[PDB]
Amino acid sequence: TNDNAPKFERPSYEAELSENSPIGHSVIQVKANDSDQGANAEIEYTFHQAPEVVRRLLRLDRNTGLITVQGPVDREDLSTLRFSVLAKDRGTNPKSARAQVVVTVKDMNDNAPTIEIRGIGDVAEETAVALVQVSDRDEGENAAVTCVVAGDVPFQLRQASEKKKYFLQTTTPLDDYTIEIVAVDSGNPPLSSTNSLKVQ
Ligand SMILES: [Ca+2]
Ligand SMILES: [Ca+2]
Ligand SMILES: [Ca+2]
Ligand SMILES: [Ca+2]
C-alpha cells in the first residue's frame, strides 16, 4: 500500500522566458520523487487547475515534467505566468503533492515606436506648430526612443519637460513645407517609424 507522498525537488520554481519563443521550446523541467516502489511511486505531472492563459501558452509533459512552449508568448500582453504543478503517483489511494511555478516573460524589441501628430495652426521664431507624442510598447532600452526631424528644415522638436510629448516649433521665421518626423528605439536590433506632416 501507498506509504509516501510524492515530493518535488524544490518547493517552488522561478524561470525566465523571452517572449515570441518558438513552439516546442523548453521552458523548465519539474521533478518529484516517491520513496515508494511500483505504481505507488510512478508520478504523473498535471496542471488542469492552471489559468486558461498558462494552459493556452504552455504544454506540461505528463511523464517527464517538461514544460515547453505551445502558444504565442507576448510580454506586452502578459509579463508573468504564475501557476502550480500537481504531481500524484498511481496508488488506488493516489497521494499527491504540489509545486508552484513563476515564469517572468522577458521583453523582445518586437514593437516599433509610434508617433502621433496634431497641428496648432512673419511668424515668430521658436513658435510651436505641432504636438508630437511618442510611445513604444516594449520595456527599458527597447522603449528608449530617439525622435528627430529628418531633412534640413527650419523646424525642430523640444520636449514638454519630463508617452513622451514634444513641441514641433520654429528655428527662424518667414511669410509651405512637408516635414518628416523619425523615431528609433535604443534596443538591438532597433526598430523605427516615421510620420510626414504639412504645416497649417
Ligand atoms: Ca507514493
Ligand atoms: Ca510583444
Ligand atoms: Ca516586447
Ligand atoms: Ca521597441
Residue numbers in the entry: 216 to 336, 350 to 390, 396 to 408, 414 to 438
What do the study's own words say?
The PCDH1 EC3-4bc structure (T216 to Q438) had one molecule in the asymmetric unit, had poor density for three loops in EC4 that were not modeled, and it was used as an initial model for phasing the PCDH1 EC1-4bc structure by molecular replacement. Crystal contacts in the PCDH1 EC3-4bc structure are not expected to reveal a physiologically relevant interface as their areas are small and repeat EC1, required for trans binding, is absent. Nevertheless, some of these contacts could represent low-affinity transient intermediates for both trans and cis (from the same cell) interactions.
Protocadherin-1 (PCDH1) is a non-clustered δ1 protocadherin involved in respiratory diseases. PCDH1 has seven EC repeats (labeled EC1 to EC7 from N to C-terminus), a single pass transmembrane domain and a cytoplasmic domain with the three conserved motifs (CM1–CM3) typical of the δ1 subgroup. PCDH1 may bind bronchial epithelial cells and epithelial cells of the airway mucosa together by mediating homophilic adhesion and helping in forming the epithelial barrier.
